[PDB]
C-alpha cells in the first residue's frame, strides 16, 4: 500500500519515492520492504526517533533540500545496512547530536554539505569504519578537533572547503590512512601543525588555496609521499628566509602545483615562490626562526 502520493516500485531496488511534494513530516506507512527512500525537496523540519526502523533492508536514504532543524539522536536506529545517507542542503540544521550515526557500520557515503553545521561533536564519526566519502563543505565549521576522523580508516574523500577553519592541529587527520583527496580551500587556515599530515601517505590531492597562510614548515608536506596535485594559491605568502624550506620542497616535487604567489616583499609581489632563485629568499621581510 503506497503511502500518500509516493511512487513505489520494485526494480531494480524496492523504492519509495516522494520528492518535492511539500511534505512537512516523514510520511507514515512507508513499506517496510523499502531498500531506497527518497524524501528530498520537501519541507520536513524534524526527524523523530526510529523513523525508518521498520525498513530493515534500507540501503539508501535521501533527505536533502528539506527544512531540517532537528534530527533525533535515535533517528537512524536499526539501519545497520544503510550505505548512503544524504542530509545536505538543510542550511538551518546547525547541529547534529554526536551519537546520531552510531551503528551505521555499512555507511559508505555521508552528505552533510550546506547544513549550516557549527561544530563536529566528540565521537560524531565514531565507528564509521566503512565510510569512503564524507561531504562537509559549505558549512559553518570553526575548528578541527583532534581525532575527529580517527575511525575512518577507509575514507578516500574528505571535503572541508567553504568553512571557517582557523588552523590544523596535529591529530586532526589521524587515522585517515586511505585518504586520497583532502579539500581544505576557502577557509581561514593560518597555520598547519608540522606533523598534521603524518597519516596521509596515500594522499594524492591537497587543496589549501584561499586561506590565510603566510608560511608553511617543510615538515608539513614531507609525509605526503603520493601527492600529485597541490594548490596553494590565494594565500598571503611571505617570500623571505622563512619560505626557503617550502621552496626547497617545491623544487623536488614531481607533481603538479599551483602558483605560490608572494604577497611580501613588494619587489616580489605576485611572483611565484616556486619560480624564484634561492638568492631571492635572503633576509627578513616587513618574528620567527631565521628572522
Ligand atoms: C529483507 O530482505 C529479505 C530478503 O529479501 C527478506 O526476507 C526480508 O523480509 C526483508 N525485510 C523486510 C523488512 O522486508
Ligand atoms: C575497507 O575497504 C576494503 C576494500 O577497499 C574492505 O576489504 C574492508 O572490509 C573495508 N573496511 C571496512 C571496515 O568495511
Ligand atoms: C589572517 O591572520 C591575521 C593574523 O596573523 C589576522 O589579523 C587576519 O585578520 C587574518 N585574515 C583573515 C582574512 O581572516
Tell me how far apart the 2 most distant CA atoms of the chain are, in Å. Answer: 77
Instruction: Determine the atom of ligand 1 nearest the C-alpha atom of 57.
Output: 1
Cell numbers that stand for 19 in this block: 520528492
Indicate which ligand has the atom closest to the C-alpha of 129.
2
Report CA(10)–ligand 1 centroid distance (Å): 13
Report CA(16)–ligand 2 centroid distance (Å): 29
Protein residue with its CA nearest to atom 1 in ligand 1: 57
Nearest Cα to 239, choosing from 206, 208, 283?
Answer: 283
CA 133 to chain centre: 8
- In units of Å, what resolution does this entry have? 2.0
Peptide bond into 20 cis (omega under 30): no
- Give CATH for domain 1-291: 3.80.10.10
**In the chain, where are the structural domains located?**
1-291
Cell numbers that stand for 242 in this block: 622563512
Protein residue with its CA nearest to atom 14 in ligand 2: 130
Nearest Cα to 224, choosing from 201, 251, 208?
Answer: 201
Cα–Cα–Cα angle for 181, 216, 253, nearest 5°?
A: 60
Determined by X-ray
Question: How far is the C-alpha of 236 from the C-alpha of 234, rounded, in Å?
Answer: 7
3-class state of residue 88 by DSSP? coil
CB atoms within 10 A of CB 143: 15
User: Are 135 and 160 within 8 A, CB to CB?
Assistant: no
Amino acid at each position: 500500500p503506497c503511502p500518500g502520493a509516493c511512487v513505489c516500485y520494485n526494480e531494480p531496488k524496492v523504492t519509495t519515492s516522494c520528492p518535492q511534494q511539500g511534505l512537512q513530516a516523514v510520511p507514515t506507512g512507508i513499506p517496510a520492504s523499502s531498500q531506497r527512500i527518497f524524501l528530498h525537496g520537501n519541507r520536513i523540519s524534524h526527524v523523530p526517533a526510529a523513523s525508518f526502523q521498520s525498513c530493515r533492508n534500507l540501503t539508501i536514504l535521501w533527505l536533502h533540500s528539506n527544512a531540517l532543524a532537528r534530527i533525533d539522536a535515535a533517528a537512524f536506529t536499526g539501519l545497520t545496512l544503510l550505505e548512503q545517507l544524504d542530509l545536505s542542503d538543510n542550511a538551518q540544521l546547525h547541529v547534529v547530536d554526536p551519537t546520531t550515526f552510531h551503528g551505521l557500520g555499512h555507511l559508505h557515503t555521508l552528505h552533510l554539505d550546506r547544513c549550516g553545521l557549527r561544530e563536529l561533536g566528540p565521537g560524531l564519526f565514531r565507528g564509521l569504519a566503512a565510510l569512503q566519502y564524507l561531504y562537509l563543505q559549505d558549512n559553518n565549521l570553526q575548528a578541527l578537533p583532534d581525532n575527529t576522523f580517527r575511525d575512518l580508516g577507509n575514507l578516500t574523500h574528505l571535503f572541508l572547503h567553504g568553512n571557517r577553519i582557523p588552523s590544523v592541529p596535529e591529530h586532526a587527520f589521524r587515522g585517515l590512512h586511505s585518504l586520497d583527496r583532502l579539500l581544505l580551500h576557502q577557509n581561514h587556515v593560518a597555520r598547519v601543525h608540522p606533523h598534521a599530515f603524518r597519516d596521509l601517505g596515500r594522499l594524492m590531492t591537497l587543496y589549501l588555496f584561499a586561506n590565510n597562510l603566510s608560511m608553511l614548515p617543510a615538515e608539513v608536506l614531507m609525509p605526503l609521499r603520493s601527492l600529485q596535485y597541490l594548490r596553494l594559491n590565494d594565500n598571503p605568502w611571505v617570500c623571505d628566509c622563512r619560505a626557503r624550506p617550502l621552496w626547497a620542497w617545491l623544487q623536488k616535487f614531481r607533481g603538479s602545483s599551483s602558483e605560490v604567489p608572494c604577497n611580501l616583499p613588494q619587489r616580489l609581489a605576485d611572483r611565484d615562490l616556486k619560480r624564484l632563485a634561492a638568492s631571492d629568499l635572503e633576509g627578513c621581510a616587513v618574528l620567527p626562526k631565521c628572522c
